[PDB]
């Protein structure tokens, strides 16, 4: 059975994740989907060249977890669909993590983070998807293990992509 350690979509936008650099990259956006109020972290700096934007989750107490499974749901926009569209447009983002004994709070040092994987969309959102109000929601899962320290963070690095993160779910399997 799955024990849930983190569930963004369930938190009703109360989570307040740290972004870096201060007030530049990811933003908490709000919207209506399926007649329900939802939140998302999104970033779309496709015109501005070299991007390096970090969204860090709050510290997650590990407990008895050894291998954690990370479920991401997100959209990614077609680099072709930008009137301008510099060759600095990307269609991936990166998933990182870091283990810790204590919560560092507002401290964020990227080089403490280890890359888990590049996250790529199966389904790209194309310009026609806009007037059709069609949400193509990608689902990607990764796992990291064995975890050893008292807690851990996840972080998401944007490198110049147009992404909306709707869901982040971390869990372990007991037995």
């Amino acid at each position: 059975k799955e024990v849930v350690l983190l569930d963004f979509a369930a938190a009703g936008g109360e989570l307040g994740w740290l972004t870096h650099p201060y007030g530049k990259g990811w933003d908490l956006m709000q919207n209506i989907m399926n007649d329900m109020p939802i939140y998302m972290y999104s970033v779309c700096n496709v015109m501005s060249g070299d991007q390096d934007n970090w969204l860090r989750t709050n510290w997650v107490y590990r407990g008895e977890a050894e291998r954690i499974f990370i479920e991401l749901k997100f959209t990614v926009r077609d680099c072709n669909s930008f009137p301008g569209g510099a060759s600095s447009c990307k269609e991936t983002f990166n998933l990182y993590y870091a283990e810790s004994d204590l919560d560092y709070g507002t401290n964020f040092q990227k080089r403490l983070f280890t890359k888990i994987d590049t996250i790529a969309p199966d389904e790209i959102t194309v310009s026609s998807d806009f007037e059709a109000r069609h949400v193509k929601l990608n689902v990607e899962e990764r796992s990291v293990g064995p975890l050893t320290r008292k807690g851990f963070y996840l972080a998401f690095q944007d490198i110049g992509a147009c992404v909306a993160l709707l869901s982040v779910r971390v869990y372990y399997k007991k037995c």
Binding site: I32, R133, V163
Partner: protein, 130 residues
């Protein structure tokens, strides 16, 4: 310096002229702040559906469809503070249900009360300069 605050309630005098318009730059935020209380009776607490609409629906002060629902002020006494719609005036979204905002254009919000008196039409014009 960067974000604009609008108190969305029928006591806000700025709504009285129905010409209420705020001027923003690209990437500015507008924080629409729902009616909030900590005691009048539950029935007396103001509740709204906010819509983001085209000029014509703004003129009529009436939504065209469900698709235009932007947010709901249906938590008038939430312990965590007032309910809040934070709209960033981005040029581009990754989210296909959200809106894109362009320099030189104007955008329009209207509301309807949730099962309550509409004494006056509540609307807002947001103009992006540049």
């Amino acid at each position: 310096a960067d974000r604009h605050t609008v108190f969305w309630n029928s006591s806000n005098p700025k709504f009285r002229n129905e010409d209420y318009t705020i001027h923003v730059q690209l990437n500015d935020y507008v924080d629409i702040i729902c009616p909030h209380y900590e005691s009048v009776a539950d029935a007396a607490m103001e509740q709204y559906i906010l819509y983001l609409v085209e000029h014509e629906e703004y003129q009529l002060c009436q939504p065209q469809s469900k698709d235009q629902v932007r947010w709901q002020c249906n938590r008038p006494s939430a312990k965590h503070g007032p309910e809040k719609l934070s709209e960033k005036f981005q040029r581009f979204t990754p989210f296909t249900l959200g809106k894109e905002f362009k320099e030189g254009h104007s955008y329009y919000y209207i509301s309807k009360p949730i099962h309550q008196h509409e004494d006056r039409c509540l609307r807002l014009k947001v103009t992006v300069s540049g």
